Design a protein around this ligand. Structure first.
Ligand code: FAD
Length: 522
């Protein structure tokens, strides 16, 4: 008889799943599918840290966990999760041509990877008589609608986006959070049926599995943590993003729902709905941009902008990105990536990236600034790539948008507002608790130098059992001069961008790069 297939990619959850719902109705049997793409999941010995070439082992373990939770939640309703390994496009059509499937459902998505897959699968299904339901539930708004309504392009600013965006449909909507039951799986036919694969099966040695980010994945954890994240009504009511403490690691200054919203473990519509409820239950609460709900709106802003901008994930070809002659220097990038820059604050943060796969927004700010238009002047696409595989909440739209923001390549252009690798952390942690924790090599350094070990008298060092240049590196660069040179180049780069009416050529750029080379080398 007529069967259905619920294809899972990002909505790794049972609650608020418009796609899963439809797949359960009018079907005597249902096929829940998820494909492990070797290219993204399997071990890559060439990578700079355990994982594939696109994902650190941390985000991978998170996904695998989300998958187990999901299957489990399905095995509860009498269903199950069928996991195949291979190129999704191939796997999917081979599933269609193998099963009596008349209806194919999967949550919509705007990432390039998925836009590409969905054209193929859609065309195959359409040409083979399979119905296709691809509802928008990963975001509160439909990028295409916003862009269409706004004329022909995406609103140029948060403020402008909210005006146009209006309010999400899920507002007065009633979401489906549970199901009494779910259609039985149905003939598995002849396909390599598989259970969620272990890190080992993905090719990872045990030493590559020693560390553990402190955040389990899955819808279960998701919902549980949301409950904890917003239990304090006053806190959520008085929420102001800029006022959070970036050094607070024992108790993160924000929700950390980031990874669950990225893999769809948590519906953002439900979250948005909860916030709404507790907002009306008080009377006085913060509003965007700084509000907690205002944060779900930043996600919306970048997604819409990302979906409407070709070459969004790169400078060249990007309508909205300022053309800047960034340097390239695997040695400098490496020093920053592994957290060996010399500035304890920056290094401590980069280590939290590697160990937690998450850092407070402001921390992400500092290291992104230091790496680009703040001190090193390395291409933002480079910090972007490092972040993309290390963050357990790595999100295409969000990550690219933010790196362009922190590099003053787009959205924000007050490049003379530079974070200080030395003094910023003090504003919150003068004792340097955060640093000591993630950089135990400086465990004993006296607070008078914790943010600048290179200024600690040689005697203090040896006693603190930390010698700059041996145990802990010395400043890879001197902030003052560095940031002053960045502010300089940044100036002439903007000058060129303005002179060429936002259309700098491959030529001009090259000539600027040369020009700056002279004025800053001889
Ligand atoms: C250079 C740089 C790279 C970044 N890369 C990513 C990334 O790959 N994935 C990612 O999810 N966030 C990224 N961010 C944005 C932000 O830091 C995170 O969303 C936030 O730290 C997540 O913590 P939280 O869940 O406690 O956020 P909360 O403050 O508790 O907000 C709740 C939710 O709102 C969303 N949100 C919060 N801030 C932003 C923001 N500035 N832009 C868009 N959405 C936001 C997130 O989905 C988050 O889970 C990046 C920021 C910078 C400066």
């Amino acid at each position: 008889g007529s069967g259905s297939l619920i294809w899972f990619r990002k909505g790794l959850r049972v609650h608020d799943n418009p796609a899963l719902e439809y797949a359960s109705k009018g079907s005597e049997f249902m096929y829940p599918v998820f494909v492990i793409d070797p290219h993204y999941m399997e071990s890559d010995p060439s990578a700079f840290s355990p994982g594939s070439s696109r994902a650190g082992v941390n985000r991978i373990r998170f996904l695998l966990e989300s998958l187990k939770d999901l299957d489990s939640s399905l095995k509860k309703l009498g269903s199950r999760l069928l996991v195949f390994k291979g190129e999704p496009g191939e796997v999917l059509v081979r599933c269609l041509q193998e099963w009596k499937v008349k209806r194919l459902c999967f949550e919509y998505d705007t990432d390039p990877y998925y836009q590409a897959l969905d054209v193929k699968v859609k065309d195959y299904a359409s040409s083979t008589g399979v119905e296709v339901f691809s509802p928008v539930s990963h975001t509160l708004f439909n990028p295409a609608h916003i862009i269409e309504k706004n004329g022909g392009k995406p609103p140029l600013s948060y403020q402008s986006f909210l005006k146009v965006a209006g309010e999400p449909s899920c507002a007065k909507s009633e979401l489906v959070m549970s199901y009494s039951s779910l259609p039985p799986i149905g003939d598995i036919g002849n396909l390599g049926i598989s259970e969620v694969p272990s890190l080992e099966e993905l090719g990872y040695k045990d030493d590559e599995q020693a560390d553990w980010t402190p955040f389990r994945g899955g819808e279960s954890e998701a919902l549980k943590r949301l409950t904890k994240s917003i239990s304090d009504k006053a806190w959520v009511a008085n929420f102001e993003k800029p006022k959070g403490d970036p050094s607070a690691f024992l108790k993160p200054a924000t929700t950390v729902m980031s990874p669950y919203l990225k893999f769809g473990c948590l519906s953002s519509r439900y979250f948005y709905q909860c916030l709404q409820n507790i907002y009306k239950d008080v009377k006085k609460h913060t509003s965007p941009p700084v509000s907690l709900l205002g944060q779900l709106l930043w996600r919306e802003f970048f997604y819409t902008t990302a979906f409407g901008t070709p070459n969004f994930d790169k400078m060249k070809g990007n309508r909205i990105c300022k053309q800047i002659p960034w340097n390239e220097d695997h040695a400098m990038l490496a020093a920053w990536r592994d957290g060996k820059t010399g500035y304890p604050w920056i290094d401590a943060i980069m280590v939290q990236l590697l160990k937690w796969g998450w850092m407070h927004h402001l921390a992400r700010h500092c290291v992104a600034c230091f790496l680009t238009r703040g001190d090193l002047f390395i291409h933002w696409e480079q910090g972007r790539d490092v972040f993309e595989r290390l963050l357990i909440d790595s999100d295409w739209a969000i990550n690219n948008g933010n790196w362009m923001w922190l590099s003053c390549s787009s959205f924000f252009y007050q490049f003379n507002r530079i974070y200080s690798p030395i003094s910023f952390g003090k504003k919150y942690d003068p004792d340097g608790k955060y640093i000591r924790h993630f950089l135990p090599v400086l465990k004993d350094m006296p607070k008078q130098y914790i943010y600048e070990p290179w200024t600690a008298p040689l005697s203090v060092q040896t006693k603190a059992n930390c010698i700059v240049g041996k145990d802990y590196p010395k400043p890879m660069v001197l902030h003052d001069s560095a940031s002053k040179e960045c502010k300089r180049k940044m100036g002439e780069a903007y000058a060129l961008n303005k002179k060429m009416d936002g259309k700098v050529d491959e030529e001009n750029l090259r000539d600027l790069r040369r020009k700056l080379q002279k004025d800053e080398h001889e």
